[PDB]
Nucleic acid binder design. Structure first.
Lengths: 76, 58
RNA sequence: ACCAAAGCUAGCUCAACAUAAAUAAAAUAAAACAUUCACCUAACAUUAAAGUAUAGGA
RNA sequence: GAUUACCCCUUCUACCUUUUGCAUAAUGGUUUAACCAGAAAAAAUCUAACAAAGAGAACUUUAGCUAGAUACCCCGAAACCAGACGAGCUACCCAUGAGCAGUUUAAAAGAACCAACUCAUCUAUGUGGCAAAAUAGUGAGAAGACUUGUAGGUAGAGGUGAAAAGCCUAACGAGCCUGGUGAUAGCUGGUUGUCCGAGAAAGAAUUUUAGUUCAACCUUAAAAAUACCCCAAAAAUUCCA
RNA sequence: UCGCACACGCUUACAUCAGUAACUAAUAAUAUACUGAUAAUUAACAACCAAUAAACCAAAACAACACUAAAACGUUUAUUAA
RNA sequence: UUUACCAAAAACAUCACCUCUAGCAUUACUAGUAUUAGAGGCAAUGCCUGCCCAGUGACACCAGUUUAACGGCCGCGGUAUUCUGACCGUGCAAAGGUAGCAUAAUCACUUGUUCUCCAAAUAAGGACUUGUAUGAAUGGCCACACGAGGGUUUUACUGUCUCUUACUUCCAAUCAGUGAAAUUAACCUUCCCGUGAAGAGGCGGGAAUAAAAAAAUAAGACGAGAAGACCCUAUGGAGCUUUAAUUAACUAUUCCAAAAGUUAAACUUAACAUGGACUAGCAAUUUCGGUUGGGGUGACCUCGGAGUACAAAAAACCCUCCGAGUGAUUUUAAUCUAGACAAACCAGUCAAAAUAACCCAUCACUUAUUGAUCCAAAAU
C-alpha cells in the first residue's frame, strides 16, 4: 500500500561530553559534532570526525571570538 | 567373514547426508574337487577366493 | 438415633546371604530439520587417570 | 453493630482462575469425606576442623583446604514406530446346496402387473427411544448383473472397492491390541500453615511477538565512598557552588 | 390372529414337591422364565467306516425334443480284504 | 450398481465403437493362443467425427511420422439511402471453430429481445445470435422406449386453504405400587430508569409485594448440551500432489570383473546364478519466514542523510523526502605505548607521545557504500 520507502538510522550521540569548569584528562573526548559547530582552541586537538579532544591535563573553558569563531581551551 | 554382511551406504561417500543400511551377500558357485583319502569326489559351494588360498595350501 | 464413622489381622516391598530362515526401530533432543543423540538386546567390579586425549551441521 | 432468650431497621457487588480491568451475563466447582502436584551444590553465602596446609595415599592451594547446612512441581494430546491379533460384521471371490405364488398371453424360465424374499422413495412418529438405524402408511426389484445357508481365501510400508475417499467387528484421509512411553506440548487447566521488612508495568535483539538472552529495575549479605535538590561563571535542559 | 416341526447353535433355563419377609420377573396376582430339594427316555432317529484298478457318451427345465450359459448329485466290471 | 448410519441422483456399471501393448508354455493370466489376453477413452442405436505434429508423449532413430495421443483452433482497416460487409488490404501464429448447436446443466451485463402459456409468468416452451465464457470419441447433434432423477401447463378430486368444527383411541390429568435422568458455587430469587468489561433478581434510586402448590404458556436466568467444525495463532499432526530440495530398495541398460575361445613372438564371446560403479522410468524422507489496525494479496525486511523528534542525547506508526550494496583521479596509510567517546552481548570513532625509515588526499552537498561462526582456495 505504501509506495515510498525509507529506513531508520541509529543515533551516533553527537554532542558535548565535557563542560566548562570540569577537570579532564589528556586524550579525553571533549565534543563530538558534525562539521564545525565550534572550533578547537589552545591545547585542543582536532579529529577526522571533527571531534575535539584534550591534548594535555587541565580545565575546559569556552571562549567566543569575533574578527565569528568559538574556541575551546584546556588550561593546565 | 562373507555370509550375511550388513553395512551402511552413503551417497558421495562423505556424509552430511542420509545414511542408509545396505545388505551384502557373498558370491556362490560350484567347485568340484577330488579327495583321494576319502576316495570321494566332493562338491563345494563355498567361497571362491578361499579356493585361491586352498590352491596355495597344497 | 437413622443411613453411619471407630475398634484388629492376613499381606507384602527392598537389602544381604544361601541356593524353512534374516543388522530391531521410531517418537524424541539439536525449541523446525537432514549429519548427530547418554541411553536400551548380550557381554560390561573399586580409587584415580577424567569429563582429560579426541570426535561433532567444530 | 444494636436490640429482644427469637426477627423486621440501618452498614456491605460470591470464591477461584485468567486479565489493562470480573458481583460480572468470562473460567472451574451438587455437597461431604479422603486422595492429590518444588525431591538436583558447581561457583557462592553460612556453621565448624586445621592452616602454608587441608583432606582416611585422591585432589586443591599467593589463605587455603575439608565437612555439614541453604535454591529448579504434576495432569493432558491429535500422531509416529515395532510386534501381533481381526473377513462369526462388512467388501469381493472360491467350493458345495437351497429359494423366488398367481393373472393376460402368439412357440417362448419370452414381456407387464402383483404375494414371499431382497431393498429403504417420500411423509409422519420416535429423539437418554421399542431400537447406539426403529415403527406406520407409501414406494423399487421380484428368472435376474437375483436372494440365501454351510464349508474357505484376501489386512494396515495393505486388502477390497459396477470408484462414494466407501468398507475391513456400531466413529477408517487409513483398523484394533500390546510395547517403545511417564513420546512430544513455548499451550491451557492446577499447586495446600502463621507473622515481620522491603517491593516491579517495558533498552536493544531473536525462523522472534502466547518464548528466551544480558541491560532498565529489585532482593540478601558486607565494604569503600560520597550523592543528590543544584544560583551567577558557561553550551527546555546539559554542568557546578 | 400366525404359527407347529428339522437344524447351526444355548449349557438344566426345565418337570415334581416345598417355601416366597428378603432378592428375583420395573408391582400385585403369581410364575414357562425366583429360592431350596428332588425327577430328566427309546429305536428300525440323527452322527461314526471298505482299498484300488478298468468301461462309457448324447445337460438340467414332470423333454421323444429344442435351446443356451455347454451341463449338482450317476453306474458297471475285476482283484484284494474285513 | 454406489457414500452400512444426513446424498440413490444427470454419477458408476452396461451392450457397442476406437486406439494401443502382447507369437509366449506346465500352481494368475490359461491347462487360453490375434476371432485371444491386458490397458485407455467413449457409451444402445441413428447421422457424423473437419483443421493444426512448432512444444510434450509415443513409434522408427536425431530426422521424420503420429489427434478415437497430451492439447490448440486470431486481430485491425476499407468498400453500396441508414445499417450491415459477399469482397479487398494488413499484422500475427504450428494451424486460427468445418457440420451441427446456442441467454443452453454453459449468457457476466440479464428479468437479452420477440412469440406462446396466465386476468399478472425473474420460472417454462418455441425463435433470433455480439457464443463475457458451445463444439464434433473428457465426442457433436437428434432419437422410439425406459426413469421412486431434475422442471413447466390444463383437467379431475380433495380440511391443502378461505376456515375451521366434531368424534374415537394411546398419552397428558387423578389415585396406588416401583421409582430415573442430564443439570446444580451457595441462593431469602419482582419491576422500571441509569450505571457497571458497554444487555443487573444481588449496584444505586423509585415502583410493587403476607406465606406455599397444581394444571399450562416458553420471554429471561447471555438456559442445558459439544475445551467452535468458520477466523487466526503453534517454528502441532495427518492425507493427497509435484519440474520443492535431497536419494538406499524394485523393473530394464553401459562398462569392468567371474566363467569360455582365439592368434603372434596383444584380442574377441555370454546359456543359468551371482558382483562393483553407472544411466532412465518407479519409490523413500521432510520443509513450507516474519512484519501486518484479522488473514491472504500487495508492500516491506540491512545501511546512510534531511523532517516528524523548537537551544546536550535518545524516542514510534503500513508517517514524509532523498540516497547505497559502489564510481574515478593521484600519492600512499610501516611498527605500537598513553588516555577517552559510544556500547546488553557483539560490532564502531578520536588519538598526544616513542622507535624504524621519509620529510592518506579530492571528488558523488559533508558523511553511506556492508556480513558475526564453522567449513574451501592462490599458498603460507
Amino acid at each position: 500500500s505504501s509506495k515510498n520507502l525509507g529506513g531508520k538510522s541509529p543515533g551516533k550521540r553527537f554532542g558535548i561530553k565535557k563542560m566548562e569548569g570540569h577537570y579532564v584528562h589528556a586524550g579525553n573526548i571533549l565534543a563530538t559534532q558534525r562539521h564545525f559547530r565550534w572550533h578547537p582552541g589552545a591545547h585542543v586537538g582536532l579529529g577526522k570526525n571533527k571531534c575535539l579532544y584534550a591534548l594535555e591535563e587541565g580545565v575546559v573553558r569556552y571562549t567566543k571570538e569575533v574578527y565569528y569563531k568559538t574556541f575551546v581551551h584546556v588550561v593546565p | 567373514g562373507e555370509g550375511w554382511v550388513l553395512g551402511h551406504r552413503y551417497v558421495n561417500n562423505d556424509k552430511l547426508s542420509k545414511r542408509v543400511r545396505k545388505v551384502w551377500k557373498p558370491q556362490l558357485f560350484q567347485r568340484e574337487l577330488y579327495s583321494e583319502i576319502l576316495d570321494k569326489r566332493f562338491t563345494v559351494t563355498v567361497t571362491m577366493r578361499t579356493l585361491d588360498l586352498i590352491d596355495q595350501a597344497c
